[PDB]
């Protein structure tokens, strides 16, 4: 379709009809929906971005974290445990491999899988340490949606890191299996397990 005359020719799939901004020219930000209405407005699948990595002024005001690209936030939160500070390119490669795996396993256009996972892994009831001295008992509160998504993404990345540590399954594979098991109700995922523990300990200490 319309091979445009250039003295420096972009390859075909990178050229033809790019009036179709997508993630990696592989996965579509269209056909992506959030199930819950609670986590919408705090998941930024609205803007299609070519790389989940962008130097944004996204920590100046109180809620500028809300409109950061969710896949970019997953990349960014992937870098943890000192030996990996900075190194955003490695995190981007890891998320790219994870996106590939999420594609080929359980085709299910991977952005939908990741958004479903973060939706179903955002804890809604937590506890605070109201106990002053004598009755050091924690009391239950409910969770703000921004806190929900942030805690879900942190739980997913920390479970991925824990699984991949000193193990033969590469961090891409571990993150992908974490996301897949989180998208379904599979209690084998670390994130869903800890989130369930949090919800249940909130229920116990209402």
């Amino acid at each position: 379709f319309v091979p445009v005359e250039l003295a420096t020719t972009i390859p075909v799939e990178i050229q033809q009809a790019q009036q179709e901004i997508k993630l990696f020219n592989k996965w579509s930000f269209e056909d992506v929906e959030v199930k819950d209405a609670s986590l919408v407005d705090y998941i930024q699948i609205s803007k299609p971005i070519y790389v989940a990595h962008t130097a944004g002024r996204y920590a100046n005001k109180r809620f500028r974290k809300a409109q950061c690209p969710i896949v970019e936030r997953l990349t960014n939160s992937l870098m943890m445990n000192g030996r990996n500070n900075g190194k955003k390119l490695k995190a981007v490669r890891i998320v790219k491999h994870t996106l590939e795996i999420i594609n080929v396993l359980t085709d299910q256009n991977p952005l939908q899988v990741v958004v479903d996972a973060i939706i179903n892994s955002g804890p809604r009831e937590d506890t605070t340490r109201v106990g002053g001295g004598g009755a050091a008992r924690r009391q239950a509160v409910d969770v703000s949606p921004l806190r929900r998504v942030n805690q879900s993404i942190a739980l997913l990345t920390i479970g991925a890191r824990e699984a991949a540590f000193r193990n033969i399954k590469t961090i891409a594979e571990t993150l992908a299996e974490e996301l897949i098991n989180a998208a379904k109700g599979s209690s084998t995922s670390y994130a869903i397990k800890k989130k369930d523990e949090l919800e249940r300990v909130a229920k116990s200490n209402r």
């Binding site: 809604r124 937590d126 002053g132 509160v141 409910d142 703000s144 949606p145 806190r147 229920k203």
Partner: protein, 64 residues
């Protein structure tokens, strides 16, 4: 059973808690918006946001 309800917060009635992290929210049930409750939220939130609850009639007092 999962009797969760969605409630849109319309007012932030200040902040409370021991360390000062949890916030008062005046939520208004998305089903039958005639009813309003006050409850206690961990994490930042603005007006117009919605919340998911399991307990519905629990109008918890100020944390202290």
């Amino acid at each position: 059973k999962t009797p969760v309800t969605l409630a849109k917060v319309i007012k932030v009635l200040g902040r409370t808690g021991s360390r000062g992290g949890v916030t008062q929210v005046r939520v208004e049930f998305l089903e039958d918006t005639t009813r309003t409750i006050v409850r206690n939220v961990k994490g930042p939130v603005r007006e117009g946001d919605i919340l998911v609850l399991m307990e519905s009639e629990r109008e918890a007092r100020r944390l202290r």
